[PDB]
Scaffold this active site. Structure first.
Site, PDB file in Angstrom:
ATOM      1  CB  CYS A 162      -4.522   0.422  -1.649  1.00 56.07           C
ATOM      2  SG  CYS A 162      -4.219   2.197  -1.584  1.00 56.07           S
ATOM      3  CG  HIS A 211      -4.387   1.355   5.560  1.00 55.56           C
ATOM      4  ND1 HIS A 211      -4.102   2.364   4.665  1.00 55.56           N
ATOM      5  CD2 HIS A 211      -4.196   1.883   6.792  1.00 55.56           C
ATOM      6  CE1 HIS A 211      -3.755   3.452   5.326  1.00 55.56           C
ATOM      7  NE2 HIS A 211      -3.804   3.188   6.619  1.00 55.56           N
TER       8      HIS A 211
END
Lengths: 168, 88, 88, 168
Positions: A156, A108
């Site tokens: 991301c 992440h």
């Protein structure tokens, strides 16, 4: 054939290699000790499980091996553990007899950087891309001086969809 | 004798999206960027340098769907072309 | 009808040095990076794409003297090769 | 000959151009309106004078004109003025009938970014590279959609000499 060490990677023929002063030198195949490192975070304390990460690990591990690299795979690390792992990787004696390296990070991510396993909005656990460069540069990794260092990051970089509308 | 060397050189980074923006991952098929990178590396490592391969990966993302992303090459200090020469 | 487009695409940045590090400027001759860029653009715009020219500029800085710097290509989302085609 | 519009830039012959699907399209020479912008800070309130900056301005201006760009030159601006100038540049109607653009920034610099004319350690006057990208992207500059945007920056990125020692 895909039965060889290079698997599904298309081979460069001897004629093609001769066709290709402005290229990074390649060390002898018989004696070189190429290293690669994959850090992949799948299970987190506060962020959802990264389902499918195992497919990424398998794919990148096999590809890097196909390209001639000995691959170390480390999973579910804090930014502190990632730093310790990077520092250890930079100290590996094999880099001395290597011509290049690959570093793969999969987790992440937010704008500031890559999420460690303990990351939450209240207590951030982030590894910055800047720290990765610093740990692998000529000062902190003299063994990789003049050698290509390839950093791959799946994450991301914020919450935006990355798109805008236009009319024809 | 001691000699000077650049502190930072021969780096290339390749990120799954542009700053501020999301990167996508399929629950069973894996991360789109990773899958796309592997396919391009398998096809083009024989003929193209790493910078050119990364550009090709970028081109494959050009037409945006419902889940768009634009991989970004970052902080490049490669002074030469890096060819993988697969098989050698 | 409306269509989606990537918010950030077709960019290339070229900085005079690496992060943390100085860039040099001669009082009468001008900035080293700027001067070196002009010379390479004049020579290679005809035959090389902008990314390749920037790499060549980097290579020219490889051997460090008393005033060292390593130009850095940043935040690249060029999906194609950008040739200047000087004269056309 | 250097007497032409391309000056000292070596010409690409018709045979060479035909030798060169993966290339950015070039608009017709007769009708295209290429734009470039140079922002150069020489005189500052608190930072020393950037002697030789005029040589850089001359060199970059002439080169960009040689390459077919109409060049706007703006001098001694604060980060606020630079932002206003960038915003105005993004709004220029000529970009619609252009195939590309060049942006050149030349000033004192720190790690965080490019120094405005009023910059001091007590009261920072900095333009971030991130802001330059944002102002020129598809959202804020739709006219340059799908077109190469080249950003050139002459500036320090910190105070370090950028070197390390090694022995033979």
């Amino acid at each position: 054939t895909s039965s060889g060490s290079e698997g599904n990677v298309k081979l460069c023929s001897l004629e093609e290699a001769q066709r290709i002063a402005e290229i990074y030198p390649i060390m002898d195949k018989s004696s070189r000790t190429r290293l690669a490192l994959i850090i992949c975070n799948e299970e987190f304390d506060s962020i959802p499980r990264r389902t499918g990460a195992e497919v990424d690990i398998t794919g990148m591990t096999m590809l890097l091996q196909n390209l001639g690299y000995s691959v170390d795979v480390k999973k579910n690390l804090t930014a502190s553990d990632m730093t310790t792992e990077l520092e250890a990787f930079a100290h590996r004696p094999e880099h001395k007899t290597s011509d290049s390296t690959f570093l793969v990070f999969m987790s992440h991510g937010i704008r500031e950087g890559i999420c460690g396993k303990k990351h939450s909005e209240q207590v951030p656990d982030i590894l910055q891309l800047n720290a990765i460069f610093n740990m692998l540069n000529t000062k902190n990794c003299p063994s990789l001086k003049d050698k290509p260092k390839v950093i791959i990051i799946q994450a991301c970089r914020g919450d935006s969809p990355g798109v805008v509308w236009f009319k024809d | 004798a001691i000699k000077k060397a650049h502190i930072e050189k021969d780096f290339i980074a390749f990120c799954s999206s542009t700053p501020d923006n999301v990167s996508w991952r399929h629950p069973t098929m894996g991360s789109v960027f990773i899958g796309r990178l592997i396919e391009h590396m398998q096809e083009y490592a024989c003929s193209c340098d790493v910078e050119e391969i990364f550009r090709k990966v970028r081109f494959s993302f050009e037409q945006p769907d419902g889940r768009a992303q634009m991989p970004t090459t970052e902080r490049v200090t490669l002074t030469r072309c890096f060819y993988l020469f697969p098989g050698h």
